[PDB]
Amino acid sequence: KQRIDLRLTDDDKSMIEEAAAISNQSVSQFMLNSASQRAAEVIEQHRRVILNEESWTRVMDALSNP
């Protein structure tokens, strides 16, 4: 539905083509799936960090006082 302009370096492109052929995908399917899974990972990590900093905040408040 949307549109994105991606520029690469003949090395990146050949390497993406090679990996896409290994995994029986189009070059677009490969780029999208790579970005999608990576974005998933990164959001999941960011969620863990947020939860960490909340429990940090909770102990540091408890050590200030009720």
Partner 1 sequence: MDDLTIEILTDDADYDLQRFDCGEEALNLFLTTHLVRQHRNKILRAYILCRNTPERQVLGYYTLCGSCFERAALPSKSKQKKIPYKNIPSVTLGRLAIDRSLQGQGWGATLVAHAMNVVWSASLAVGIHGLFVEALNEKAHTFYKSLGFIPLVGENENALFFPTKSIELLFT
Q: Which residues bind partner 1 (CB under 8 A)?
A: 14, 17-18, 21-22, 24, 43, 46-60, 62-66
What are the structure tokens assigned to 39, written together?
């974005």
* 3-state secondary structure string across 48-60: HHHHHHHHHHHHH
**Residue 10 binds which entry of its own copies, partner 1, none, with Cβ cut-offs from 5 to 8 Å by kind?**
its own copies
CB of 33 to its own copies, least distance (A): 6
By C-beta, is 35 or 56 nearer to partner 1?
A: 56
Strand, helix or coil at 36? helix
Contacts (Cβ under 8 Å, ≥6 apart) of 6: 31
Told to check if 57 binds its own copies by CB under 8 A, we report no
